[PDB]
Design a protein around this ligand. Structure first.
Ligand SMILES: [Mg+2]
Ligand SMILES: [Mg+2]
Ligand SMILES: [Mg+2]
Ligand SMILES: [Mg+2]
Ligand SMILES: [Mg+2]
Ligand SMILES: [Mg+2]
Ligand SMILES: [Mg+2]
Ligand SMILES: [Mg+2]
Ligand SMILES: [Mg+2]
Ligand SMILES: [Mg+2]
Ligand SMILES: [Mg+2]
Ligand SMILES: [Mg+2]
Ligand SMILES: [Mg+2]
Ligand SMILES: [Mg+2]
Ligand SMILES: [Mg+2]
Ligand SMILES: [Mg+2]
Ligand SMILES: [Mg+2]
Ligand SMILES: [Mg+2]
Ligand SMILES: [Mg+2]
Ligand SMILES: [Mg+2]
Ligand SMILES: [Mg+2]
Ligand SMILES: [Mg+2]
Ligand SMILES: [Mg+2]
Ligand SMILES: [Mg+2]
Ligand SMILES: [Mg+2]
Ligand SMILES: [Mg+2]
Ligand SMILES: [Mg+2]
Ligand SMILES: [Mg+2]
Ligand SMILES: [Mg+2]
Ligand SMILES: [Mg+2]
Ligand SMILES: [Mg+2]
Ligand SMILES: [Mg+2]
Ligand SMILES: [Mg+2]
Ligand SMILES: [Mg+2]
Ligand SMILES: [Mg+2]
Ligand SMILES: [Mg+2]
Ligand SMILES: [Mg+2]
Ligand SMILES: [Mg+2]
Ligand SMILES: [Mg+2]
Ligand SMILES: [Mg+2]
Ligand SMILES: [Mg+2]
Ligand SMILES: [Mg+2]
Ligand SMILES: [Mg+2]
Ligand SMILES: [Mg+2]
Ligand SMILES: [Mg+2]
Ligand SMILES: [Mg+2]
Ligand SMILES: [Mg+2]
Ligand SMILES: [Mg+2]
Ligand SMILES: [Mg+2]
Ligand SMILES: [Mg+2]
Ligand SMILES: [Mg+2]
Ligand SMILES: [Mg+2]
Ligand SMILES: [Mg+2]
Ligand SMILES: [Mg+2]
Ligand SMILES: [Mg+2]
Ligand SMILES: [Mg+2]
Ligand SMILES: [Mg+2]
Ligand SMILES: [Mg+2]
Ligand SMILES: [Mg+2]
Ligand SMILES: [Mg+2]
Ligand SMILES: [Mg+2]
Ligand SMILES: [Mg+2]
Ligand SMILES: [Mg+2]
Ligand SMILES: [Mg+2]
Ligand SMILES: [Mg+2]
Ligand SMILES: [Mg+2]
Ligand SMILES: [Mg+2]
Ligand SMILES: [Mg+2]
Ligand SMILES: [Mg+2]
Ligand SMILES: [Mg+2]
Ligand SMILES: [Mg+2]
Ligand SMILES: [Mg+2]
Ligand SMILES: [Mg+2]
Ligand SMILES: [Mg+2]
Ligand SMILES: [Mg+2]
Ligand SMILES: [Mg+2]
Ligand SMILES: [Mg+2]
Ligand SMILES: [Mg+2]
Ligand SMILES: [Mg+2]
Ligand SMILES: [Mg+2]
Ligand SMILES: [Mg+2]
Ligand SMILES: [Mg+2]
Ligand SMILES: [Mg+2]
Ligand SMILES: [Mg+2]
Ligand SMILES: [Mg+2]
Ligand SMILES: [Mg+2]
Ligand SMILES: [Zn+2]
Lengths: 101, 116, 112, 140, 59, 154
RNA sequence: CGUGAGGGAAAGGUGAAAAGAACCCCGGGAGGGGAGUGAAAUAGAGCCUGAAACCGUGGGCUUACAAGCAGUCACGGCCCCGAGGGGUUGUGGCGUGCCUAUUGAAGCAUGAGCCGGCGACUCACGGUCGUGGGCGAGCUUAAGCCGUUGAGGCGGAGGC
RNA sequence: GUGGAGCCUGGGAGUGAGGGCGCGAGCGAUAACGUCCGCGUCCGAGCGCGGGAACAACCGAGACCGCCAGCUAAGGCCCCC
RNA sequence: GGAUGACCCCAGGCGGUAGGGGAGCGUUCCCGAUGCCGAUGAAGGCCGACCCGCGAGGGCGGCUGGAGGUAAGGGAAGUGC
């Protein structure tokens, strides 16, 4: 089995055992959550419209993080406009436990 | 009291030249040409961050459009099938499903032709 | 074991000397001695002496066999410049740089 | 997750009959085959497409008055070196270049763009020497 | 004349590219059939003094 | 640039020298030339309102008075100008030497003794100032000094 | 430097102590290699620290069908440190230096070889706003005199 | 109509070389990347982004940052793309 | 919301030249300091993919270096190329 789930405005394919970083979910570390499923596939194959009724992917949140700092700088020539900005986009690391569905 | 430059300027130049390591000629070794280079780099990265979301979506489409025609419809006709079918699987996973799990992508084709 | 000799402040332009030092790098000692003897270059004299002083060190100081010697390394670093005045036309005075060099030869035992 | 990048493909060999098909309307497809845009795993930065073996490019056909009117141009670098060749004469002299010139200009410019042009191997007459690869005869 | 002048400072890369033809070719030497020493070919041996097989000059 | 030693000659002409334009070498743009807005001798003093320095003097004592670190002594018994005398006296007065003390008394001998103690500042009551008050964790005063303290803040 | 008046530089640092390297080896010497001193000798007198441009040696990656403000985004290969990183860059995408002056510059308009250090909105007195406090129909002292020797107090002339 | 609206008193400015485009006229030749006004606009300062092959001012649209998510605008959908 | 910056929530604004404003980093120096860090290594130099900060910066570790450095909190300028 695999599942296409949607969290943090994006869609990711998940499987039991997989680790991934999605947008920062409001949850306590070590807790578990149900991710809404848009498609199941593998043995069976079920198509969401857009989602599926009794479908949920269980994930345990291992912890939240701050990505590698990305420098975003803007420079406008001949106009003495310079800006330096440091960005660490937060994330949440999840372990996909089981695919109910 | 007198405050000469002392340690300040070189430390700020050592900050910039470190961020310019890998550049060609004086672009990596000269502070001034490292600045003019790191300006351009700082803008290109901000643009190509924006352009990256554009780049992959186009790559996803071309692959989606490729696996569609193996079934007899084009990209445009397929996407509208998914809209009328109500399937919000995005183009990242769509193209992913096209190469790896074509039997699922084949099913998604049926739902698109049947929504017609 | 390695041996080393340096000829510091050799009054000659390093760029001219490296041309000769390139000939002997990685070469066996006797070969280099033969090479340096007939290279038609002012620098061949100096390189030959630093080489002979390094080979002497190996034998005398560092328990290395003369027959087992080769030029493991050799490089010409530039020393201070002797800035001299060259009178040009129209009253202008240029400044000629008469250049020194630090010639290094490093020897090792090539076993065969 | 990240986009699947394919392990190096084993390219396919393709045989097209060019006889009586329109010049630009066959050229544009052969470019798509060369570019590999028919492959679900299409990667824009590697050589991926097929090897398009074309025959009977002498019998390619074109519309209008383009036999007398369309003029392929060559510049030498010397004064007055602007050579003009009507599609007419080029067919009589080097007929394989008509398809090549058309197909080339529809491929990207740059390193990968030229590597793919080396994969198009045009011939006149019904025969081709690449039977060693056994190209799948395509109806396009 | 109007005193031609270099437009831009030549790069380290470019000047070293020019000097890619500047390596000295080692002196070509052959052994002297009398004293075996390395001497230039077609020259009176400077170590023993032989050539053609016979003594020619003092050493 | 006018107080520097160099002369006022224009080193080379204005134009046609192929070199940037300059005047005397006393200009601050030259190494060894003058400095532009570097310091001159200044008088930093200014007349704070007496009623502020008066209120400050009283308030500073008040802060020590609140936290109990104010002690008015009747006199200093066995101290006659020797330091070790004052040491034993501080030991009777609950002044071990772990709190910085402002000693304020009109007696020269008592002042003479504590002078060289690292944890004691000495003062004649006319010299009572809030800085030395705030510096000191404790404050000791002859009742001579307390008397004239009231006089100044009257 | 200038006939002269006159102009007018640069240039400091071994170490606690010379203990400043006897003597041996290559060399004409210079220089070095050992031995020796020293906590330290990349503290050896061309001496504390020893940055940068600059030059060189060695190694990893890469480069001879390739079109470039030199980067950037993506992917792949290789090398290193050990679902992660760092170095390199083959391909694809995108991409008109910095400053200055301009209606407008990548601009074939100004300035800059490069690097290091020096280099430009200050102070005084008055003014006028705002602001932090003291006092309030009042507020405040100036020079000075006294005191301390980084102590403060006096001084009402005068000024608002 | 609660808007980086308006009004009153003050402190601090900078600007007082504009430019293109649409309309309205004038000068010009119902010439000029012409010149001079009126209304508006954009550049100026948005030479940040999409289109227009490329191109300050034409069309689209006012970039706080991140995402390998989605919808559209002008413009596009044979290949380059 | 809690009650006067504790943090939390909801919503909206955040292109920008001349220019006005606000909040901060860093440099020399004074107080704090008859203290404190310091030969088990000061400042400075060389690294770093590590930690913190929007940033300017701060740390932290390794190497060099071989005698100085200086906190919370304030003060003053020959203060950032
Ligand atoms: Mg559920
Ligand atoms: Mg630009
Ligand atoms: Mg501008
Ligand atoms: Mg500028
Ligand atoms: Mg300065
Ligand atoms: Mg460097
Ligand atoms: Mg859709
Ligand atoms: Mg020169
Ligand atoms: Mg292109
Ligand atoms: Mg002539
Ligand atoms: Mg000439
Ligand atoms: Mg080189
Ligand atoms: Mg060259
Ligand atoms: Mg003068
Ligand atoms: Mg005069
Ligand atoms: Mg001039
Ligand atoms: Mg010049
Ligand atoms: Mg001057
Ligand atoms: Mg001078
Ligand atoms: Mg001076
Ligand atoms: Mg004392
Ligand atoms: Mg004290
Ligand atoms: Mg006293
Ligand atoms: Mg003279
Ligand atoms: Mg004279
Ligand atoms: Mg000393
Ligand atoms: Mg000697
Ligand atoms: Mg010893
Ligand atoms: Mg030594
Ligand atoms: Mg030392
Ligand atoms: Mg020294
Ligand atoms: Mg010392
Ligand atoms: Mg060095
Ligand atoms: Mg160095
Ligand atoms: Mg190398
Ligand atoms: Mg070719
Ligand atoms: Mg090649
Ligand atoms: Mg190239
Ligand atoms: Mg890609
Ligand atoms: Mg890697
Ligand atoms: Mg390009
Ligand atoms: Mg101008
Ligand atoms: Mg102009
Ligand atoms: Mg002009
Ligand atoms: Mg140019
Ligand atoms: Mg000009
Ligand atoms: Mg220019
Ligand atoms: Mg001008
Ligand atoms: Mg010059
Ligand atoms: Mg500089
Ligand atoms: Mg001012
Ligand atoms: Mg004022
Ligand atoms: Mg005031
Ligand atoms: Mg008041
Ligand atoms: Mg009064
Ligand atoms: Mg005293
Ligand atoms: Mg307004
Ligand atoms: Mg007003
Ligand atoms: Mg106003
Ligand atoms: Mg005017
Ligand atoms: Mg006007
Ligand atoms: Mg206007
Ligand atoms: Mg119209
Ligand atoms: Mg005009
Ligand atoms: Mg007009
Ligand atoms: Mg302007
Ligand atoms: Mg624009
Ligand atoms: Mg442009
Ligand atoms: Mg465009
Ligand atoms: Mg906005
Ligand atoms: Mg917004
Ligand atoms: Mg759409
Ligand atoms: Mg297409
Ligand atoms: Mg919030
Ligand atoms: Mg917001
Ligand atoms: Mg802005
Ligand atoms: Mg605004
Ligand atoms: Mg200690
Ligand atoms: Mg200091
Ligand atoms: Mg740091
Ligand atoms: Mg250190
Ligand atoms: Mg000392
Ligand atoms: Mg410090
Ligand atoms: Mg301090
Ligand atoms: Mg502080
Ligand atoms: Mg200054
Ligand atoms: Zn012989």
């Amino acid at each position: 089995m695999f599942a296409i789930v949607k969290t943090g405005g994006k869609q990711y394919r998940v499987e039991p055992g997989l680790k991934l970083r999605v947008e920062k979910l409001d949850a306590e570390p070590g807790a578990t959550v149900e991710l809404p499923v848009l498609l199941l596939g593998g043995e069976k194959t079920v198509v969401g419209t857009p989602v599926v009724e009794g479908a949920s992917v269980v994930a345990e949140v291992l912890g939240h993080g701050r990505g590698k700092k990305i420098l975003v700088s803007k420079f406008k020539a001949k106009v003495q406009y310079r800006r330096k900005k440091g960005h660490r986009q937060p994330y949440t690391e999840l372990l996909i436990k089981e695919i109910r569905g | 009291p007198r405050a000469k430059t002392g340690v300040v300027r070189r430390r700020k130049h050592k900050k910039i030249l470190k961020l310019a390591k890998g550049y060609w000629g004086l672009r990596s070794k000269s502070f001034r040409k490292a600045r003019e280079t790191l300006f351009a780099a700082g803008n290109y990265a901000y643009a190509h961050r924006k352009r990256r979301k554009r780049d992959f979506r186009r790559l996803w489409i071309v692959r989606i459009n490729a696996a569609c025609r193996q079934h007899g419809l084009n990209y445009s006709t397929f996407i509208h099938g998914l809209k009328k079918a109500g399937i919000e699987v995005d183009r990242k996973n769509l193209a992913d499903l096209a190469v790896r799990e074509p039997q699922v992508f084949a099913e998604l084709v049926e739902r698109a032709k049947a929504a017609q | 074991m390695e041996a080393k000799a340096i000829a510091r402040y050799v009054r000659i332009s390093p760029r001219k000397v490296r041309l000769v030092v390139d000939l002997i790098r990685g070469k066996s000692l006797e070969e280099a001695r033969n090479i340096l003897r007939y290279t038609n270059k002012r620098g061949a004299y100096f390189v030959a002496k630093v080489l002979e002083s390094a080979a002497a060190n190996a034998v005398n100081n560092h328990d290395m066999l003369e027959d087992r010697l080769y030029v493991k390394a050799a490089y010409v670093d530039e020393g201070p410049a002797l800035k001299r005045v060259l009178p040009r036309a129209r009253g202008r005075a240029d400044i000629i740089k008469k250049r020194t060099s630090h010639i290094t030869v490093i020897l090792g035992e090539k076993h065969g | 997750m990240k986009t699947y990048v394919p392990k190096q493909v084993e390219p396919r060999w393709v045989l097209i009959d060019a006889e009586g098909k329109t010049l630009g309307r066959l050229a544009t497809k052969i470019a798509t085959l060369l570019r590999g845009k028919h492959r679900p795993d299409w990667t824009p930065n590697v050589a991926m497409g097929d090897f398009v073996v074309v025959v009977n490019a002498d019998k390619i056909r074109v519309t209008g008055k383009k036999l007398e009117q369309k003029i392929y141009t060559r510049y030498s670098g010397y004064p007055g070196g602007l050579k003009k060749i009507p599609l007419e004469k080029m067919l009589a002299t080097h007929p394989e270049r008509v398809l090549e010139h058309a197909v080339k200009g529809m491929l990207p410019k740059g390193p990968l763009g030229r590597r793919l042009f080396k994969r198009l191997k045009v011939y006149a007459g019904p025969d081709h020497p690449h039977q060693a690869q056994r190209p799948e005869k395509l109806e396009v | 004349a109007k005193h031609p002048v270099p437009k831009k400072k030549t790069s380290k890369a470019r000047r070293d590219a020019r000097r890619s033809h500047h390596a000295l070719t080692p002196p070509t030497l052959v052994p002297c059939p009398e004293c075996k020493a390395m001497k230039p070919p077609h020259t009176v041996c400077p170590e023993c003094g032989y050539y053609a097989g016979r003594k020619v000059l003092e050493v | 640039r006018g107080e520097v030693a160099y002369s006022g000659r224009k080193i080379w002409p204005q134009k046609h020298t192929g070199r940037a334009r300059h005047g005397d070498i006393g200009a601050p743009i030259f190494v060894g030339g003058g400095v532009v807005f570097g310091p001159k001798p200044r008088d930093y003093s200014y007349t704070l309102p007496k009623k502020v320095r008066k209120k400050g003097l009283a308030m500073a004592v008040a802060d020590r008075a609140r936290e109990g670190k104010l002690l008015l002594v009747e006199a200093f018994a066995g101290v006659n100008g020797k330091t070790k005398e004052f040491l034993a006296w501080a030991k009777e007065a609950g002044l071990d030497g772990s709190e910085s003390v402002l000693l304020v008394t009109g007696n020269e001998l008592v002042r003479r003794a504590a002078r060289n103690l690292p944890w004691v500042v000495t003062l004649a009551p006319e010299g009572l100032n809030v800085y030395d008050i705030v510096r000191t964790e404790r404050l000791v005063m002859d009742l001579d000094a307390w008397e004239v303290f009231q006089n100044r803040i009257g």
